[PDB]
Amino acid sequence: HIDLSALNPELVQAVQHVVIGPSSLIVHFNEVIGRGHFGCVYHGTLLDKIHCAVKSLNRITDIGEVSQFLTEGIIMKDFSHPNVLSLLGICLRSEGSPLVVLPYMKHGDLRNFIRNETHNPTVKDLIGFGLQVAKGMKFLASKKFVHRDLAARNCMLDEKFTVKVADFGLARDMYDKEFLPVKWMALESLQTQKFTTKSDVWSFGVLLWELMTRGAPPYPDFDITVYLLQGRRLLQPEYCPDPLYEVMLKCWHPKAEMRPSFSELVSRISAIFSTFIGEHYVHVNATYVNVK
Ligand SMILES: Cn1cc(-c2ccc3ncc(Cc4ccc5ncccc5c4)n3n2)cn1
Numbered sequence: 001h002i003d004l005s006a007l008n009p010e011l012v013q014a015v016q017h018v019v020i021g022p023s024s025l026i027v028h029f030n031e032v033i034g035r036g037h038f039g040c041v042y043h044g045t046l047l048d049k050i051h052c053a054v055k056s057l058n059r060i061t062d063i064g065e066v067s068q069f070l071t072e073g074i075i076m077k078d079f080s081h082p083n084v085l086s087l088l089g090i091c092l093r094s095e096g097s098p099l100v101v102l103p104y105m106k107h108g109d110l111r112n113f114i115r116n117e118t119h120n121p122t123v124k125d126l127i128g129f130g131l132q133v134a135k136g137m138k139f140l141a142s143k144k145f146v147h148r149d150l151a152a153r154n155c156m157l158d159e160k161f162t163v164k165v166a167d168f169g170l171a172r173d174m175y176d177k178e179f180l181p182v183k184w185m186a187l188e189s190l191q192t193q194k195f196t197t198k199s200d201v202w203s204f205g206v207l208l209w210e211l212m213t214r215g216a217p218p219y220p221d222f223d224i225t226v227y228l229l230q231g232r233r234l235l236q237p238e239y240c241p242d243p244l245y246e247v248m249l250k251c252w253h254p255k256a257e258m259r260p261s262f263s264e265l266v267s268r269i270s271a272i273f274s275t276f277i278g279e280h281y282v283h284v285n286a287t288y289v290n291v292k
């Protein structure tokens with residue numbers, strides 16, 4: 001129960017491009033499509049008929065938090081890019097938690113998509129997914145935004161097989177109940193708890209490994225820092241081309257400043273991608289099946 005009459009009119013006029021009126025939105029509360037600690041995600045219907053994903057944000061319980069929440073909406077909507085999950089808007093209710101309106105992702109998270117045995121990806125498709133992720137991250141890094149939780153489970157896939165870097169802003173949550181994401185963290189971040197775009201480049205190398213293994217868990221077989229400092233990295237996936245594994249190794253350079261930028265990753269990966277024609281099918285590794 002948020003006292004909405006208290007909201008500042010001048011601020012209301014400023015948040016207008018992010019505000020979705022309650023009469024324009026239908027939330028199917030009986031249809032759970034996502035679950036996180038900060039709220040459930042439901043099938044939604046937005047008018048002027050558009051399919052959407054609606055998150056009920058449990059953190060916002062008072063009018064004093066609404067102004068800041070609406071500003072997080074402005075910042076998040078300005079992160080508009082073909083390869084980044086784009087906020088459609090926010091729905092402020094007089095009864096119940098505020099609603100975060102996101103585009104519906106037909107194929108869900110990228111990790112479950114690649115893991116699904118009814119899908120037949122080629123080396124080109126998987127590299128294409130990595131390239132799209134690199135493109136969304138190039139945009140985010142250009143805005144000085146540090147993801148800190150880049151992984152295949154945190155990227156989404158739409159009806160056109162377009163990858164959207166997600167899990168940020170108002171949509172930030174732990175959507176994988178099995179889970180901090182140490183196996184995706186750079187050596188310096190595990191040690192100093194500090195994150196940068198260079199540490200997102202390390203996570204991206206791990207995401208490339210997830211793509212090539214079709215969603216295998218990284219490091220299957222517990223202190224990751226000590227494991228890495230023995231002089232170890234993830235093995236080359238069976239279907240991973242040599243130049244892409246060389247790119248992975250560059251992403252995991254011990255010196256953060258020596259890691260490629262996301263601009264260099266888009267460039268290098270676009271070249272590798274271009275050499276493929278979609279004739280090499282990527283299969284699941286027998287030693288990775290059911291490992292969780
Ligand atoms: C295993 N797993 C991962 C997620 C995930 C990851 C990142 C992210 N950023 C915003 C959202 C919420 C969302 C957005 C669109 C959806 N479309 C269709 C279906 C669910 C949707 C959920 N997520 N969800 C959910 N389950």
Ligand SMILES: [Cl-]
Pocket residue numbers: 122123124125276277278279280281
């Ligand atoms: Cl191919």
